[PDB]
Amino acid sequence: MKTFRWKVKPGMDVASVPSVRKVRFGDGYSQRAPAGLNANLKTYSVTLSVPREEATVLESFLEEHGGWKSFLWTPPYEWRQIKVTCAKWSSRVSMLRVEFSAEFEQVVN
Amino acid sequence: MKTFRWKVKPGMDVASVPSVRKVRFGDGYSQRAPAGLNANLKTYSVTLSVPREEATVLESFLEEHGGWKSFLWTPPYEWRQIKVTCAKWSSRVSMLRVEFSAEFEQVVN
Amino acid sequence: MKTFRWKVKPGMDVASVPSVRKVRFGDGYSQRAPAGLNANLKTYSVTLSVPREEATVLESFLEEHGGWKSFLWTPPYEWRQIKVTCAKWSSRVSMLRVEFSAEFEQVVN
Amino acid sequence: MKTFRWKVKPGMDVASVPSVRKVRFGDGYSQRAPAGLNANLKTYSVTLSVPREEATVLESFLEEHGGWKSFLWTPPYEWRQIKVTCAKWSSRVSMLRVEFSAEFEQVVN
Amino acid sequence: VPNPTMPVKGAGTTLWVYKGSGDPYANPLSDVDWSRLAKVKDLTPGELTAESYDDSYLDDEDADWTATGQGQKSAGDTSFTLAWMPGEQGQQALLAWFNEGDTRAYKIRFPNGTVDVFRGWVSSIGKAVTVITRTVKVTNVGRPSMAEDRST
Amino acid sequence: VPNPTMPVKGAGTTLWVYKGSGDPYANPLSDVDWSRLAKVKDLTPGELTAESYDDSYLDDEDADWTATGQGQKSAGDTSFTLAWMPGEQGQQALLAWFNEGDTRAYKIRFPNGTVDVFRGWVSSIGKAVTVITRTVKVTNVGRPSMAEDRST
Amino acid sequence: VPNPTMPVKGAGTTLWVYKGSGDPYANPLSDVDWSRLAKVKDLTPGELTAESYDDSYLDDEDADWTATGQGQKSAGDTSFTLAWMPGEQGQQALLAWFNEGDTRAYKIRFPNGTVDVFRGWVSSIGKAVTVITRTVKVTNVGRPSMAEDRST
Amino acid sequence: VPNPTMPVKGAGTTLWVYKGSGDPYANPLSDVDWSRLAKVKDLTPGELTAESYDDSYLDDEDADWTATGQGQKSAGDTSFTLAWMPGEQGQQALLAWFNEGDTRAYKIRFPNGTVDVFRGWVSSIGKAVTVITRTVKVTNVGRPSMAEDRST
Amino acid sequence: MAVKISGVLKDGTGKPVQNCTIQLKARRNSTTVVVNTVGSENPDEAGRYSMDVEYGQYSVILQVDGFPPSHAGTITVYEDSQPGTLNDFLCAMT
Amino acid sequence: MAVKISGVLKDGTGKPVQNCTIQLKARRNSTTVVVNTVGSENPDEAGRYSMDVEYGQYSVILQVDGFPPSHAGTITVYEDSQPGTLNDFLCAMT
Amino acid sequence: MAVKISGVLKDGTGKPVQNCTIQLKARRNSTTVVVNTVGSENPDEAGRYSMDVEYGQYSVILQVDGFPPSHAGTITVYEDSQPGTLNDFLCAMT
């Protein structure tokens, strides 16, 4: 398992939708259950900007994993060494720098 | 087999969604597979701007292939030369320069 | 068959989508066919702005053809003379001039 | 059958979609027919702005016909004295003036 | 001697406001009905602007040269400062006109002999507290009649 | 002696407006038909500007340096201040032109002997009340034929 | 004596424009092919700006301080006013160049002895009617070769 | 005598640019490596501004009074004008720095005895044609070390 | 009277140009022609054109199945002219 | 009269250009060629071109499938010109 | 006549570089080469290249599947040069 040591620009977004077993009744009393064990799985939206020289290197690294292989990554300042996979990324080549916008979905081993 | 040599304006976009076989189990354990062998095929959004004199030339070249023929094209700075087909294009003719917007979908042999 | 000598304001788009036959497979190798002989049929958006005095006249012309009669027209520039029909004309009467934003669809004889 | 002599603010919108009988063949040869004898019926989008004093009078007149009775109305400068009906109207009441934004759909006898 | 075709210094430049009922454009040369405003310090008449509409076309022989026409001309804004003087009925009626707020007609006369007539509504009333003066400006509405139309 | 190759103060600089029909560009040296305007206080001629379009490309051999070209050049706006002459026919014609509002051609003549011809429509009319002057501003349309095009 | 390392007052500061075909940067010191512009009233050369791109990062060890780098530097706009002259061939060529509108190269020479070459396209042609002067400005495109490269 | 606790006119105010490798913040008092710029006409140093962020809260026991905190402080832009010195190596190095475009460190010295060190990249290069001067502006990046941090 | 204007129009390669359309655009009111009136003529495959044009001031317009109107210039027909080719008026000293 | 222009066009590496087309645009109206008219011709598989051009001033354009149309230059054919390849007119002193 | 330029193209590690493409962009019209004409050459597996280059001014451009078009420089072929390698032309005094 490789890692991901590229730096991340400000504006990274984090989303969290834990899974629960909602079921609705007359006046509340909506019983709740924690569903699975590791219910919640954070989803990250990551933006980077690199000069065109190493854009090919980054693209090759992301292509090597495809959308089926996991790799270690440390979210900035966060106390967890999570494992994450990505399946959507785009790049805006303009003249000198290219900015990558990618999404990173957390997954257990 | 023709080729492509028209230069491209800044702001060109590229997107890539690798087709994977995702199946989620009880608690994570999400089985993932690469699906097809060469699953990752990029799609580019390309804009040009040419004076009206060669608008006919570009339109005729784009018409010759229709939407069923592939032509070799080397994306800017990228290493591998690819073959691509397109099926949608539009233009704005203002007074002197017509600007072209199209999408180029990479296809295998 | 009548003609259309009215002049068109800048901003026309020439959006075109040819008709092909797609059929998709795992690692591509998708076959392509040119479908009919006259695959492509351009679709223009014509914008005009005339003083109110003669506006009615143009309306009557577009009323005479309705949406079922084709008329010859020469798009500005481009080595072609085509026959077009229109069915979605619209006008904005404000004070002295009225601008028409109609749509023109190519049709073979 | 009443009439409509209230002033109309600039920016009136006009729409017209003729009803046609479209059927397409292999290579064009598209049969087209005018459908009904009087197919296209223009629909207007008309806005007014009056002080509050006679807003009640306008509302009462619009209420009298309901959404079923028709009334004669002459479009500005237009060569026809058509009869129209409306079924939607709204007002933005302020402390000095109120503005009405209604739609007038042309119907024949 | 007051007559055109030679320049005038512009010493008098009286200002009148309509009070009666009738057509102001019928004959502005007679002051039989309008009231004069007294001791105007300075005056700036409105300017008759226009508006430019696009005329550039695709198939025209001439390219790379913008083409623009004229449409929807409008009148300007007039302004003038008088010596603040609530005693006289002139600015009393002016302030009553502002408070009630209706369009009214007025004229400017010249030592040359020709008169200019405008119609509009007032939009501001100012003041100063050093040699007290009242500044008032109006915005015109509709077509004014210039002095040239009368000279023909 | 009026001729180029030595700079000129530019004292006369007469102003003319076309009245008749034909081609103003055919022979602007002939003042057979054009009407002169008298006692111009100040004049500012038009400013023939242009517009810039982007020319940078992905595969350009010289990066980190912006590139642009010129397109759709446009004429400027002319302004002139005259002594307010409600009697002289030229001013009446000018105001009638503004009121009716059609494109008209005019010229300015220099003491060096050459003439400059524009065409456009008037958009602004102003006035003053101390030594009365009238300010007229026009906007050109289409390509003007400069003095250089005639000098060859 | 013309030599660097000492300041120069800048009396001559001639301006030349290219006419022939070749590489302007091959040897700007030779004036065999370029045509001089005569009696320039004043000149303002373009300034070489840049663009600032963001560089701050989440894991960057130093916070509370912005980080910005430089990219996409561009040349400026040159302007100069001279005596309006419809006779000399230089201004004829200048106006023909504007009307046809293509990128062209030019240079400015200093009394010190070093020359500066730019390339661009012209975008304005002004005028004045008090001691007639013509003001003209161009916008540059591509890399200009500064005077500090020839000295090495 | 160069020593604080008495204000200084600031006549000398030398300017230096780093040329070597190492830590410019280690010992700016040693001018062993840095290169001096000659004949600075005028100088304006950077402005260490900050940014304001909202700090108002719903349940605060004091209302109707805004509360903003400070964050993300940034350095300003330095500017200086020199006598155009193409012969001197300092200006050649400065222009090479502009062309190649990397972050570089520099300092300004005072007759008081202490020095101020900044780091950044240049962004503008200007010129004049009457007593030629070159105007150069730079933008800093990252935290600078003020003179106070050295006096302690 | 109508003066005879006939000839063959060739491109710059000495080959007849087909799919041609020449238009005459009146600029002024004449004895028998109203201003702002157009007159069209389509030559044959050999490039031969033949017209009986009236006297007055005209502007010539050329369209080749997609060429924009090529304003080759204005022609004038006055009451001593002799029959010839269209290009003669374009090249005639005005 | 029209002058004959024949030759072979190649590239820097001594190879013929394929799928090419030479176009001549008349920038000036003449007694035999109308202004803003283009004459086009495509060479053979060996790059040999042979065409009879009319006198006048023309702009020459090279077209290749895929590449943007290149503006090779401007040529002038007088009445005293002699037959030769198209390149000689390009390199002729102007 | 065309000078024969032959040699072996290597990278900085003394190794052949594959998937190459050497082209010459014409900058000035010559006696036998038209301005703005390109000629491609693909070397073998061992990096051997050999071209027949006509005299004149060119810009040598080295396109690899990777780095964008690489401008090693402009090259000049007078009528006194001898056959050799391309690096000599790049390193030659101009």
XYZ file of C-alpha atoms in Angstrom, chain G residues 4-122:
119
model
C 26.741 53.215 -18.900
C 27.337 53.199 -15.116
C 26.765 56.986 -15.040
C 23.279 58.529 -15.147
C 22.121 60.144 -18.392
C 19.827 63.144 -18.810
C 18.024 61.663 -21.818
C 17.944 64.362 -24.492
C 17.868 62.364 -27.726
C 15.884 59.189 -26.955
C 15.039 58.468 -30.579
C 12.218 56.151 -31.646
C 12.443 53.846 -34.662
C 10.025 51.432 -36.321
C 10.876 48.374 -38.412
C 10.014 48.206 -42.112
C 11.982 45.283 -43.537
C 11.872 41.535 -43.020
C 14.110 39.590 -40.670
C 14.771 39.158 -36.973
C 14.511 42.453 -35.042
C 16.508 41.013 -32.137
C 19.331 39.789 -34.395
C 21.156 43.127 -34.205
C 19.105 46.138 -33.045
C 22.173 48.402 -32.972
C 22.152 48.864 -36.769
C 19.722 51.448 -38.168
C 20.088 50.425 -41.823
C 16.449 49.362 -42.159
C 14.380 51.154 -39.497
C 12.610 54.494 -39.938
C 12.765 57.225 -37.300
C 9.804 59.129 -35.872
C 10.462 62.865 -35.823
C 9.787 65.449 -33.097
C 8.132 63.410 -30.376
C 6.700 65.681 -27.691
C 6.741 63.119 -24.875
C 7.009 59.371 -24.327
C 5.985 56.818 -21.686
C 7.249 53.245 -22.156
C 5.337 50.197 -21.044
C 5.893 48.513 -17.696
C 6.437 44.767 -17.288
C 3.871 43.507 -14.793
C 3.272 39.953 -13.550
C 0.498 37.852 -12.023
C 0.278 36.577 -8.441
C -0.857 32.983 -7.895
C -1.852 31.466 -4.558
C 0.571 29.049 -2.896
C -0.766 28.496 0.647
C -1.314 24.903 1.754
C -3.099 23.080 4.570
C -0.084 21.174 5.887
C 2.257 24.135 5.403
C 4.180 24.486 8.641
C 3.953 28.297 8.792
C 0.411 29.637 9.121
C -0.987 33.130 9.718
C 1.009 34.384 6.711
C -0.108 34.360 3.088
C 2.117 32.758 0.449
C 1.966 33.947 -3.167
C 4.166 33.179 -6.165
C 4.769 34.880 -9.503
C 3.526 33.681 -12.879
C 2.298 34.830 -16.280
C 4.283 38.031 -16.644
C 3.080 40.439 -19.327
C 4.415 43.491 -21.120
C 2.853 46.922 -20.741
C 1.472 49.631 -23.001
C 3.670 52.233 -24.688
C 2.434 55.740 -25.429
C 3.881 58.823 -27.057
C 2.695 62.193 -28.309
C 4.401 63.967 -31.207
C 3.671 66.852 -33.570
C 0.855 65.865 -35.927
C 2.386 65.710 -39.405
C 0.426 64.449 -42.424
C 3.454 64.949 -44.657
C 6.247 62.745 -43.346
C 6.297 59.118 -44.459
C 6.697 57.898 -40.877
C 3.215 58.931 -39.783
C 1.799 57.663 -43.081
C 3.306 54.253 -42.335
C 2.058 54.460 -38.743
C -1.539 55.048 -39.800
C -1.372 52.407 -42.537
C -0.072 49.983 -39.903
C -2.972 50.868 -37.609
C -5.590 50.522 -40.343
C -4.254 47.181 -41.565
C -3.563 46.212 -37.952
C -0.732 43.693 -37.661
C 1.883 43.089 -34.992
C 5.094 44.990 -35.696
C 8.407 45.603 -33.947
C 9.937 48.929 -32.937
C 12.685 50.322 -30.734
C 13.754 53.242 -28.566
C 17.366 54.443 -28.410
C 18.906 56.375 -25.520
C 21.849 58.801 -25.372
C 23.680 56.234 -23.229
C 24.060 53.983 -26.282
C 21.792 50.991 -25.561
C 18.607 50.222 -27.484
C 15.309 48.655 -26.418
C 13.144 46.613 -28.803
C 9.439 45.862 -28.358
C 6.805 44.269 -30.563
C 3.079 44.879 -30.460
C 0.066 46.480 -32.098
C -1.285 50.019 -31.914
